[PDB]
Coordinates of C-alpha atoms in Angstrom, one line a residue:
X1 CA -25.6 -74.2 -84.7
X2 CA -28.6 -72.2 -83.5
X3 CA -31.7 -74.3 -84.9
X4 CA -33.2 -77.6 -85.1
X5 CA -35.6 -79.7 -87.5
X6 CA -39.4 -79.7 -86.8
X7 CA -40.8 -81.8 -89.8
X8 CA -39.5 -84.7 -92.0
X9 CA -41.4 -86.0 -95.2
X10 CA -41.9 -89.8 -95.0
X11 CA -42.1 -90.3 -98.8
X12 CA -38.6 -88.8 -99.6
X13 CA -36.8 -88.2 -96.2
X14 CA -36.5 -84.3 -96.7
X15 CA -36.6 -82.1 -93.6
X16 CA -37.7 -78.6 -92.6
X17 CA -37.5 -76.5 -89.2
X18 CA -40.6 -74.0 -89.0
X19 CA -38.5 -71.0 -90.3
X20 CA -38.0 -69.3 -93.9
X21 CA -40.2 -70.3 -97.0
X22 CA -42.6 -73.3 -96.2
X23 CA -41.9 -76.6 -98.3
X24 CA -44.7 -77.9 -100.9
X25 CA -45.0 -81.3 -99.0
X26 CA -46.0 -79.2 -95.7
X27 CA -49.1 -77.7 -97.5
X28 CA -51.6 -80.7 -96.8
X29 CA -51.7 -81.9 -93.2
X30 CA -48.7 -80.7 -90.9
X31 CA -49.5 -83.2 -88.1
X32 CA -48.6 -86.3 -90.4
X33 CA -44.9 -85.6 -90.6
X34 CA -44.0 -83.6 -87.5
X35 CA -40.8 -84.7 -85.6
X36 CA -41.4 -85.9 -82.0
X37 CA -39.4 -87.0 -78.9
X38 CA -39.9 -90.8 -79.6
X39 CA -37.0 -91.3 -77.2
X40 CA -35.6 -88.9 -74.2
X41 CA -33.7 -85.8 -75.1
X42 CA -30.7 -87.3 -72.6
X43 CA -29.5 -90.1 -75.1
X44 CA -26.4 -90.5 -77.3

């Protein structure tokens, strides 16, 4: 494992990571579906 998700579509649950060919759902407003640290990165 060497990469991590960056975006997640709220309509279908699909994900992307800022690498390779960009998704079709990405091509409208990137800020709407970005993944964010809603909880600390020190949790399991």
